[PDB]
């Protein structure tokens, strides 16, 4: 089980607006999971962990477009952990 915080530079190159690099964080990892077909309930039985951001911060930035500036929002991870995939 290893879910880690990873820095990401992200280039916004949209026609009309100025190029903008945004630095945010994302979670990436490997968590344990197991699954088997249950023919009694006729469905999959899943007991699984996924690498997810437990907490994050909103990152706001102004995008200087020629026909009107836009205000962008991106979640950026602050804690990455193996937690329920469906929660």
């Amino acid at each position: 089980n290893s879910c880690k915080k990873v820095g990401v530079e992200e280039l916004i190159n949209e026609k009309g607006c100025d190029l903008m690099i945004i630095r945010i964080n994302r979670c990436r990892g490997h968590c344990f999971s197991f699954t088997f077909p249950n023919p009694l309930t006729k469905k999959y039985s899943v007991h699984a962990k996924c690498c997810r951001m437990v907490e994050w911060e909103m990152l706001e930035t102004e995008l200087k477009c020629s026909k009107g500036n836009r205000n962008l929002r991106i979640p950026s991870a602050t804690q990455c952990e193996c937690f329920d995939c469906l929660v």
Binding site: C31, T35, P37, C51, P75
Partner: protein, 101 residues
């Protein structure tokens, strides 16, 4: 990344099946078990939804269906409870379909 194994699960050690008139058949049923460490991620994106999950679990690649026969039967049981149809395969793969259902 994933690992395949035939395994006994609480509900099926042994499996009990009861028809009308109350007649029961019992018997161990091996189930196909996929386990391991899929590569997963969560990241922020623009717009809605604000989050993107590459969430995956070790799932069985179903390639056939097994008819497992239950042996220990009560006197005069229906044949419908003398078998179980179980999806069968030999390999596992990372997939989000179990997360969907």
């Amino acid at each position: 990344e994933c690992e395949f194994a035939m395994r006994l699960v609480p509900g099926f050690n042994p499996l009990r099946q009861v028809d009308a008139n109350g007649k029961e058949c019992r018997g161990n049923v091996e189930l196909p078990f996929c386990k391991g460490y899929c590569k997963t991620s969560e990241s922020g994106t623009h717009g809605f939804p604000p989050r993107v999950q590459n969430s995956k679990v070790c799932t069985l690649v179903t390639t056939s269906t097994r008819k497992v026969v239950l042996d220990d039967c009560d006197d005069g049981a229906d044949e419908s409870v003398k078998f179980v149809m179980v999806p069968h395969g030999t390999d596992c793969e990372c997939s989000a379909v179990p997360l969907e259902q």
